[PDB]
């Protein structure tokens, strides 16, 4: 039931960390093996997503979805600068334009692909959970006729009560499916960790 402005406000705490650490990382870049920053960022991204996975609940306040982004601030802060420094390492000054164009093209393609996969997974797993849930709502079940009795107490018809129960099942399925995606993303991160070590150190 959030609004657009409130929903956007829940992602403010991501920028608290980078807006500070970005210069410090830039200032001290002379004495860091940037690969170790990339590895730390991947571990920090896995931590944040597992954090979201085991803590999302129907009655979670604004703070329950604001601490994880505060943590993700570190992960985002130490991922762009080092990896982009590695990406454009050793190339002559004249070609920096073409390399940047290629990098941006690949990154945008990746973003589009990620959105396309995630949305479909979310909806389909919501459907699966809906199927597995609506089974329990049948006759021959206490604490199922009681719900109908309480609903009819408020004046709702039988059909309206059925619709209300269906809506609740849908919401629960969305939360479960949404948390199943976060778990998968963190797991996938755990494997992408070590690839950054294949890059030679000509950085400069």
């Amino acid at each position: 039931g959030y609004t657009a402005t409130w929903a956007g406000l829940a992602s403010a705490p991501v920028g608290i960390i980078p807006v500070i650490l970005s210069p410090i990382i830039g200032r001290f870049a002379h004495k860091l093996d940037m690969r170790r920053l990339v590895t730390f960022s991947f571990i920090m991204y896995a931590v944040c997503f597992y954090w979201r996975a085991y803590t999302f609940e129907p009655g979670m306040d604004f703070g329950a979805s604001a601490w994880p982004q505060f943590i993700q601030g570190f992960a985002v802060a130490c991922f762009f600068m080092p990896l982009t420094t590695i990406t454009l390492s050793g190339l002559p000054p004249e070609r920096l334009a073409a390399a940047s164009s290629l990098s941006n093209f690949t990154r945008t393609l990746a973003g589009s692909i990620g959105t396309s996969i995630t949305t479909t997974m979310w909806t389909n797993r919501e459907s699966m959970h809906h199927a597995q849930l609506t089974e329990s709502v049948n006759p021959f079940n206490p604490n199922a006729q009681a719900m109908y009795s309480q609903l009819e107490g408020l004046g709702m018809t039988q059909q309206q009560a059925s619709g209300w129960i269906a809506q609740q099942i849908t919401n629960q399925g969305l939360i479960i499916s949404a948390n199943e995606i976060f778990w998968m993303s963190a797991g996938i991160f755990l494997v992408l960790l070590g690839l950054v070590w294949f890059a030679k150190p000509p950085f400069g």
Binding site: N138, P139, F140, N141, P142
Partner: protein
């Protein structure tokens, strides 16, 4: 009066609930001591023929 006797006798003979179909029991929401009306589901019988 014979008609009323017949109605009462049918009422008494119906205190034993008989299965109308051959099949298998699936759900059981009836326990000893439950208060039952003609609108309360009790069991289900699922044949395996057709």
């Amino acid at each position: 009066a014979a008609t009323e006797v017949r109605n009462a006798w049918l009422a008494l003979e119906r205190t034993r609930i008989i299965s109308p179909m051959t099949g298998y029991v699936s759900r059981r929401a009836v326990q000893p001591g439950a208060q039952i009306s003609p609108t309360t589901p009790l069991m289900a019988v699922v044949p395996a023929t057709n």
